[PDB]
Design a protein around this nucleic acid. Structure first.
Lengths: 175, 37, 206, 142
RNA sequence: GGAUAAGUGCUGAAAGCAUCUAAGCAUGAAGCCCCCCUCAAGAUGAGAUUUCCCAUUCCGCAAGGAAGUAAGAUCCCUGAA
RNA sequence: UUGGCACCUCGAUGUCGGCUCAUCGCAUCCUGGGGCUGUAGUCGGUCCCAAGGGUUGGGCUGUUCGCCCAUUAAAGCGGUACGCGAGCUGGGUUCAGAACGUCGUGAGACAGUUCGGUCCCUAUCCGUCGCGGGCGCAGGAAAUUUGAGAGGAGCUGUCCUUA
């Protein structure tokens, strides 16, 4: 029962590089990534497989040892497969569209709403309602998704507004 | 929120945690949501 | 950013394609001239000077004469300095005029208020007076000076003094008319200062 | 009946970098030498100290959550004229003055304290205009 | 505009899950610093820029002093915005 | 707050209320931002962060307080010698007069009432607001300026559209 103790294979179409002490850089079909890590940690890529180690056993080193592996797994999974998040939305006049790369939302306001994925992330609008964010970093993807969801967060009485596809909305009884 | 020094869990699904050195309580039931202060 | 400076004359009324009056202020800005063109490399900021007069040599002095003789103009009486404008546009010896502006541009104007003299708390600071009857021996006076505990008087307590003579700006005015042949501006409303006094006009700091 | 110096002084010029240093433990030495306690020819009333230069003031360090929680208060002589500046924004905008504050605080008070403060000359970065004085480096004992 | 409060969160382990948090990222107030207005180099840390004047005479070993001046300013006078 | 103790003050620390003048705290009345809701909406309740600014005019009463009328976004709670009388008033308390009730044999007395009843002071120092002079700022001068730093300002409704 431990995370960082484990190991992360590196299937193919991937190249890891310790550019320096800790500033890892990864590449592959979807693109590339970089991260700087805590230097007390120890990283060693073997043939096709990555290993991580900590010097010691403290509340700090343990946590870092777990986070580094989980984060690197996220990195390689993004560079291979990419990360994706769906978003539904529920209303009557609630819908979406795009202005080129941008996103556009006609939900509930006197005005529409505009969103800009500036950072090498793309957005897809297969339907008027459903939306997809698609990129390489879970961090940025979830960030953008929450930026969207904050626009018209749902309501409990009538489940409205933006809504993660796997969301369990709380409900009320409109008196 | 329910700000109070006597912070506890209420139901079994209530989950105490610590955050920014403060004590807090989590649950899907927002009325069970608590904090010290 | 833009700006000019001239002299106030007076006030009057003007119509606007209607019966709609306009209380107008009248300014003459004989063509101002550049004198110096400052830089961040030597002066630490970008800015220019502007002169507005044509003095007598009996009134001017040698250093002024040199400082202007960089340009091909005469000594000046009202010299001031504009900031935060386009610099490549301007040059030295370059005259600037009223046809900069137009009849709808908004403005922030600046001048020196009138001198009211050593006046009291009411006229200076808008305080209320005491009653003039019911046995009162108190009126036209500033008020208490404060409480007892600190054994002193706080700063900022307001009191008589030489009211006036302050550098004042007025924002978001509107130009009404121009007469470049007479070198005149006609501005919607009223400005600080007395007649014959300096007035620096500027593109409004929106 | 020992000596008590007067106009028999040779004030050198020292230089100090602050790339990773704690300002308190640094200042507690620079002030000592500004006062001249690093000399045998010390007297309390003559300012036997030695001139000091500090570089890379921005690049000082601190312990704990001081950058967020250490507060330099400063009051005018107006009511509610209290003002506050965190060590962080002091470091960014102007670390010269926060170094000066610390050192001034741990200097003596009076005309002599002020005059030995006047020897100090703090500079952001690594520029050091005072080449002409032919200074030298001073590593810190601490 | 910038940084923040409460709050919201993303990613994420310690604690194979969960977790707004310890690492790391972002939001977020009539509030804080700015933007706006005024004063401000006695800021004895006395700043900067432009332009003007010239480097005279007497003593005094020198130190330094006075004694006429330049640029310029004032006394005095007419007056008030 | 009502109080307890008697520590400074009886070679005098003027005491309620009101006027003018403000100032500080925040346990926030409004405005701002949020959580929860037995929050459908509109309005709300409660809690959290926030003290920047603002926070009415009248009748009765000496009054504070309070009740009432009409408004307001709101009509905040408190401290500053229950702020401020060498700044004002002096209606009340609290001198001497007189009177009612009551008590007292009586002289007289009553946090019982009523009528009427002298509020002094040329500001030395600090402090505050304004104004000048002198010197300094490694020569002497005229101008323009930088900006450390300081102060000011900083509130809010109603209507139309969205609908």
């Amino acid at each position: 029962s431990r995370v960082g103790k484990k190991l992360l294979e590196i299937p193919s179409d991937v190249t890891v590089t310790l550019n320096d002490n800790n500033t890892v850089a990864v590449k592959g079909p979807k693109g590339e990534l970089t991260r700087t890590f805590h230097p007390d940690m120890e990283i060693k890529v073997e043939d096709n497989v990555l290993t991580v180690a900590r010097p010691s056993d403290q509340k700090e080193h343990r946590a870092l040892h777990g986070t580094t592996r989980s984060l690197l797994g996220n990195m390689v999974e993004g560079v291979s497969k990419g990360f994706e998040r769906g978003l539904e939305l529920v209303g009557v006049g609630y819908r979406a569209s795009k202005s080129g790369n941008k996103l556009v939302l006609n939900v509930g306001y006197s005005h529409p709403v505009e969103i800009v994925p500036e950072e090498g992330i793309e957005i897809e609008v297969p339907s008027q309602t459903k939306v997809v964010v698609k990129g390489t970093d879970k961090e940025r993807v979830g960030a953008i998704a929450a930026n969207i969801r904050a626009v018209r967060s749902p309501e409990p009485y009538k489940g409205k507004g933006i809504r993660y596809e796997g969301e369990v909305v709380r409900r009320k009884e409109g008196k | 929120m329910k700000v109070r020094p006597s912070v506890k869990p209420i139901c079994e699904k209530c989950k105490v945690i610590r955050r920014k050195g403060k004590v807090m309580v989590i649950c899907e039931n927002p009325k069970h949501k608590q904090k010290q202060g | 950013t833009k700006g000019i400076l001239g002299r106030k004359i007076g006030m009057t009324q003007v119509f606007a394609e209607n019966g709609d009056l306009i209380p107008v202020t009248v300014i003459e800005a004989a063509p101002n001239v550049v004198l110096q063109k400052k830089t961040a490399e030597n002066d630490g900021y970008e800015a220019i000077q502007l002169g507005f007069d044509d003095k007598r040599e009996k009134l001017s002095n040698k250093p002024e004469k040199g400082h202007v003789a960089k340009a091909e103009t005469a000594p000046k009486r009202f010299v001031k300095e504009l900031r935060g404008v386009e610099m490549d546009a301007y040059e030295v010896g370059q005259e600037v005029k009223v046809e900069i502006f137009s009849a709808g541009e908004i403005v922030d104007v600046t001048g020196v208020s009138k001198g009211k003299g050593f006046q009291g708390a009411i006229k200076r600071h808008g305080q209320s007076r005491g009653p003039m009857s019911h046995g009162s021996r108190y009126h036209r006076r500033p008020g208490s000076m404060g409480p007892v505990d600190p054994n002193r008087v706080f700063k900022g307590k307001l009191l008589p003094g030489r009211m006036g003579g302050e550098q004042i700006t007025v924002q978001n005015l509107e130009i009404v008319k121009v007469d470049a042949e007479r070198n005149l501006l006609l501005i919607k409303g009223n400005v600080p200062g007395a007649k014959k006094s300096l007035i620096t006009v500027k593109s409004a700091v929106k | 009946t020992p000596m008590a110096n007067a106009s028999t002084i040779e004030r050198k010029w020292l230089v100090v970098d602050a790339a990773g240093k704690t300002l308190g433990r640094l200042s507690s030495e620079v002030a000592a030498i500004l006062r001249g306690k690093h000399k045998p020819t010390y007297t309390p009333h003559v300012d036997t100290g030695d001139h000091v230069i500090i570089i890379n003031a921005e690049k000082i360090e601190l312990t704990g959550k001081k950058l967020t929680d250490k507060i330099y208060y400063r009051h005018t002589q107006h009511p509610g004229g209290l003002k506050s500046r965190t060590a962080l924004e002091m470091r960014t905008n102007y670390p010269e003055k926060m170094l000066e504050l610390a050192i001034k605080g741990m200097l003596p008070k009076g005309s002599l304290g002020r005059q030995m403060f006047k020897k100090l000359n703090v500079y952001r970065g690594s520029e050091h205009p005072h080449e002409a004085q032919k200074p030298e480096v001073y590593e810190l004992r601490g």
